[PDB]
Design a protein around this ligand. Sequence first.
Ligand SMILES: Cc1ccncc1NC(=O)[C@H](C)OC(F)F
Ligand SMILES: Cc1ccncc1NC(=O)[C@H](C)OC(F)F
Lengths: 304, 304
Amino acid sequence: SGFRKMAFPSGKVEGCMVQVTCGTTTLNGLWLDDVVYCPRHVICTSEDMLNPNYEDLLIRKSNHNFLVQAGNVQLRVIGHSMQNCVLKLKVDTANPKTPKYKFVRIQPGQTFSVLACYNGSPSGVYQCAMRPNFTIKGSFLNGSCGSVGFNIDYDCVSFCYMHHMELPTGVHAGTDLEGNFYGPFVDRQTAQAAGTDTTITVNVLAWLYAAVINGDRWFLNRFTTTLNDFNLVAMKYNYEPLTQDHVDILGPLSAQTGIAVLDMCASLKELLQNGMNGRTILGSALLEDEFTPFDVVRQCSGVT
Amino acid sequence: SGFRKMAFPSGKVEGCMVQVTCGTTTLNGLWLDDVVYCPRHVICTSEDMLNPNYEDLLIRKSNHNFLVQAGNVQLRVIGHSMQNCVLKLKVDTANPKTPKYKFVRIQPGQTFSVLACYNGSPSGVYQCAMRPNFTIKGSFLNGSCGSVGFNIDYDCVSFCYMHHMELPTGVHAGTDLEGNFYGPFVDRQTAQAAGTDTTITVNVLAWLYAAVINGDRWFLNRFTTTLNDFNLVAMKYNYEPLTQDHVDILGPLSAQTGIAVLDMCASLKELLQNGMNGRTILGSALLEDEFTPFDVVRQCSGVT
Ligand SMILES: Cc1ccncc1NC(=O)[C@H](C)OC(F)F
Ligand SMILES: Cc1ccncc1NC(=O)[C@H](C)OC(F)F
């Protein structure tokens, strides 16, 4: 019993964190096999960030200009290349702690853990979600760039995010491990506004199922709804439209609790229309959307 | 920018998790140097838990009855002893992954990270607090016993909690690493009620300072209060009394923000009396109390 915002155990990712320095800029890198991945803005000064031409800036850099340190020992850089917004620094030594891994590009609404790092050293781990506007709501200070987001399936780490920037609104943007930004963001010190941060409806429903499994049941009502009726309400409250694909993904939770997905939609419809009336669900006074249906099943079953 | 419920990187603790089996019961153990620490109720059957005489049950167990497995390899048990509610299983091999460590008994209101484990394998990491009633609000299923709570200072892991039980109300109780339960709880399958779960006032104030640092400032008002006036309000709302010791601990946050501790107390007094009026602070619709002043400083400065 109990339900917490849980992150994946970070050990396999901690063993990959290194410090990358180029000139006067230091950030984090991810060392997998004989390659170190890091944000390409490591080659920029604060002045360069205003309007950088990364291809031109890179011409002035050689392998010996990228200082890579794993703990207290120096890695020898034998090659460098730019792939989209990430630099790939080939080193002469394979990381002995390289876990089984994959690079995945996640979709909005999916969750992952972040190992926040500074100077190649891990500071903490937290769980977050790729928002529908392609930003993440993290906790990152200057020096955290190159910190990564990931999911774990048994012994395989799927890296999905690398931190690159903070928007002027305090929200965060980054890339997948191929260097492609999520959303329309660019690695430039220019104000870039984020779109509507809508609520991840399928995740709220998954979290309501988690609440019922854990005994918080006050919000269950005598009503049902349809996908089209529910979606009129979701539109009004800046919630993502629920589809039959989302209903299908909620199937195991509906089966375990015996609460039909459309009945849980009607409970959510009432919570949106009436509010919580000073009450809480799983220790929260708002509707939580950073648990996927898979996260709920995993936590509720104890998958290791 | 941004402020998250962050757990310590769990790698150093993952390297200590092992599986302990005695008879038909399996739970987690903590392997440090040549000792494996685990809850003494590993020697009980479900029937024994009703009224166990641990000293008598232990007489029927020998070193070879405690099966300890670290990953896929078996540890040889060369001694066993009971210290309060924990068993200490001496093994013939020192854990090569033993980090620098200490055993600490924490006070109510202090936070720590939990590495939830099943069958010796880590499932996830989350942050929580020792409540004023000596329970923790965790996420633990059957098989999670022996999972530990800890804090990290640079390279030293301070273990403070070992999970032993779930109360009939869905809250959790456990011991320090000396086997002494926090609070009045016992390792018996008897209903034991928890006391008033009061709010950790110093932690709420610390979190309001974190909110101001991150730009959420709507709750700042034109008022001040006194410790005695604030405490009358804290009493009414089941908040812990604020002392001059708590004010002193909030000093660095008061210094950084320029907001006097008693002025922040007056903001909190108004939030208690008026509610949030449908607004949020750091993504929360309630007053968060599971960040200590030390946690706020650490996260706001990027300590690794
Ligand atoms: C300051 C800071 C704080 C937290 N997270 C990231 C950054 N860093 C940036 O925004 C970098 C400078 O720009 C990126 F787009 F290239
Ligand atoms: C069931 C369960 C689920 C989650 N956490 C712990 C337990 N386990 C217990 O309560 C054990 C049986 O009693 C302890 F007091 F000795």
